[PDB]
Amino acid sequence: IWGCSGKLICTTA
């Protein structure tokens, strides 16, 4: 779920 809402670790490739 591509959703960066308050997340240092929101890189998922």
Amino acid identity at 5: S
Exp. method = NMR
Q: For residue 9, what are its two tokens?
A: 């670790």
Residue 11, CA atoms < 13 Å, CB-side half-sphere: 2
Q: For residue 11, what are its two tokens?
A: 């890189």
